Design a protein around this ligand. Structure first.
Ligand SMILES: O=c1ccn([C@@H]2O[C@H](COP(=O)(O)OP(=O)(O)O)[C@@H](O)[C@H]2O)c(=O)[nH]1
Length: 304
């Protein structure tokens, strides 16, 4: 279609056809909270995430709906997830452990040594001696306890959103391919190397999305609270696998000693790719990259 503008560089609007799969994510830290034979996805009045996922499947009947799950689920809870796959044809439950992320991994000792040499290749006047000391202390901890600790194995041990955001970016790098790697059958219109549209489980679909047009085939959620705006990872849409914006975000985490999956893997990758530097208008970049669709009621866990 048309084009989109950021400062003086112009970007073609690439399509995300109506068969681009949707992606929901639920990593359950305490599966025993649910019934032994109950679908282990939160479904309260407060947080009706399972209902929001099913309702998206009912609206997008011919579009594949991926549900990336993880957790120490009981045997009866995994059969409940299989029954969910039966009732709703387009829902594809993908276990995060069933995917191979090793091609995006890097050893922590390599990252630390690279940064120790780089910080030490500077004179005493520009040396960040506090950062230098912390990196050697992180490296010392790895060599003493887990010398083969990697970005994946380290994030696999973390508690909280930092672990969800980490695997979320890697899945989106795989894109549609992740469904074929997990062996999900009957996706029909899924193309190898195709895109994906991640949504937070509190983002409710009210109508069909149709075909989207995003600058270079990528757009993310822009949250507005009070009078502020911010890039967010509650929605990430890509038209192809290994999108260079998400690849650059992972590249930042391969070069930073303590890279964050959200701030560096998403916000850093987008701003580096589209050249949203210190000199640029952060608000202008948000309007240019924002994921807009009136058929999505965004962020309803902020009270709705
Ligand atoms: O126990 C949890 C909590 C959250 N999430 C995922 O993290 C997303 C963000 O949830 P939340 O709205 O609490 O985070 P916030 O948007 O405030 O960062 C959810 O949509 C889920 O996909 C998850 O997998 N497990």
């Amino acid at each position: 279609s048309g084009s989109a503008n950021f400062a003086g560089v112009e970007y073609p609007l690439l399509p995300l056809d109506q068969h681009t799969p949707l992606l929901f994510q639920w990593f359950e830290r305490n599966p025993s909270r649910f019934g032994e034979n109950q679908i282990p996805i939160i479904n309260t009045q407060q947080n009706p995430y399972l209902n929001n996922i099913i309702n998206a499947a009912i609206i997008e009947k011919e579009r594949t709906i991926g549900v990336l799950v993880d957790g120490n689920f009981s045997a009866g809870q995994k059969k409940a997830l299989a029954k969910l796959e039966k009732q709703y044809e387009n829902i594809k439950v993908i276990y995060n452990s069933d995917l191979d992320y090793s091609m995006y991994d890097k050893k922590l000792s390599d990252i630390y040594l690279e940064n120790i040499a780089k910080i030490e290749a500077q004179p005493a006047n520009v040396r960040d001696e506090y950062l230098l000391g912390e990196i050697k202390k992180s490296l010392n901890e790895v060599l003493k306890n887990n010398p083969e600790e990697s970005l994946v194995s380290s994030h696999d041990k973390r508690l909280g959103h930092v672990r969800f955001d980490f695997y979320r970016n890697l899945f989106l790098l795989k894109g549609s391919n992740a469904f074929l790697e997990a062996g999900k059958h009957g996706c029909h219109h899924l193309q190898p190397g195709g895109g994906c549209i991640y949504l937070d489980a509190d983002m409710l679909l009210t109508g069909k999305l149709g075909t989207l047009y995003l600058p270079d085939g990528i757009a993310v959620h822009v949250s507005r609270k009070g009078n502020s705006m911010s890039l967010e990872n509650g929605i990430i849409a890509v038209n192809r696998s290994e999108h260079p914006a998400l690849k650059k975000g992972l590249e930042i985490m391969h070069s930073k000693p303590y890279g964050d999956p959200y701030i560096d893997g998403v916000c850093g990758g987008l701003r580096h790719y589209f050249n949203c530097s210190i000199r640029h208008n952060y608000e202008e970049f948000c309007n240019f990259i924002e994921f807009k669709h009136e058929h999505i009621f965004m962020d309803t866990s902020s009270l709705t």
